[PDB]
């Protein structure tokens, strides 16, 4: 009963459960489709935007719940919790939707089962970043990531000591360390055959970061393409 092994096992379990209970699996969702601008790309389908942004809001709420379940997160300063959530919001939204990708139909499925094709995702808001996001979803396939790994990657994204304007960057950085070790160990126990899968899976965060940076600019462009304000929670996050 080596101590750290015991602690990391239970850290791993908390995170797996937190992810599962805040993000349903693709296989567990009753999928449904819609005919709204499904055949050609447009600047913005307002109907699709409304539904898209409603589901985004609901997912952000789930991401907050997920965060609160991460060991030590609610031990950070209130300002830091806010800072971390805002900084990782898009990272996690991108990762989540990209784990809901079906290659056969080239679609992505939301937490209510709504399944849109590439053209509809574009028209819902993805716009110029559509293909970039779909490419990333494809690159995730060969990895075979499960709830545990996706949850850990999400936690690592959130608990990041290098985010700007943190009050206690060191505390946050130290809190991330156990997450990194837990991911390494889990990948090892789950992929004995595959050698350097830890670096490979971990560095998908590099992708998220790039897409997220471009995504922040896309959201700004959306602010002026929509004949109205974005949902207030989305406004608050993107500030």
């Amino acid at each position: 009963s080596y101590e750290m092994t015991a602690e990391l096992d239970d850290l791993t379990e908390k995170i797996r459960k937190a992810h599962q209970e805040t993000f349903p699996s693709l296989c567990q969702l009753g999928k449904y489709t819609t005919n709204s601008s499904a055949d050609h790309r447009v600047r913005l389908d307002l109907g699709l935007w409304d539904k898209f942004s409603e589901l985004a809001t609901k997912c952000i709420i789930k991401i907050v719940e997920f965060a609160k379940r991460l060991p030590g997160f609610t031990g950070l300063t209130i300002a830091d919790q806010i800072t971390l959530l805002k900084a990782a919001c898009l990272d996690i939204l991108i990762l989540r939707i990209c784990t809901r990708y079906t290659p056969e139909q080239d679609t992505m499925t939301f937490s209510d089962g709504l399944t849109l094709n590439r053209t509809q995702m574009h028209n819902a808001g993805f716009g110029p970043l559509t293909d970039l996001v779909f490419t990333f979803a494809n690159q995730l396939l060969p990895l075979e990531m499960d709830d545990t790994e996706t949850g850990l990657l999400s936690a690592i994204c959130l608990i990041c000591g290098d985010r700007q304007d943190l009050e206690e960057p060191t505390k946050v950085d130290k809190l991330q360390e156990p997450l990194l070790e837990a991911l390494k160990i889990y990948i090892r126990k789950r992929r004995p055959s595959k050698p350097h899968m830890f670096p490979k899976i971990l560095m998908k965060i590099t992708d998220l970061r790039s897409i997220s940076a471009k995504g922040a600019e896309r959201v700004i462009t959306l602010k002026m393409e929509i004949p109205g304000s974005m949902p207030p929670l989305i406004q608050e996050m993107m500030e």
Partner: peptide, 10 residues
Amino acid sequence: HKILHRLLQE
């Protein structure tokens, strides 16, 4: 905005 703080606190 007040939503995020309410979500946090609740």
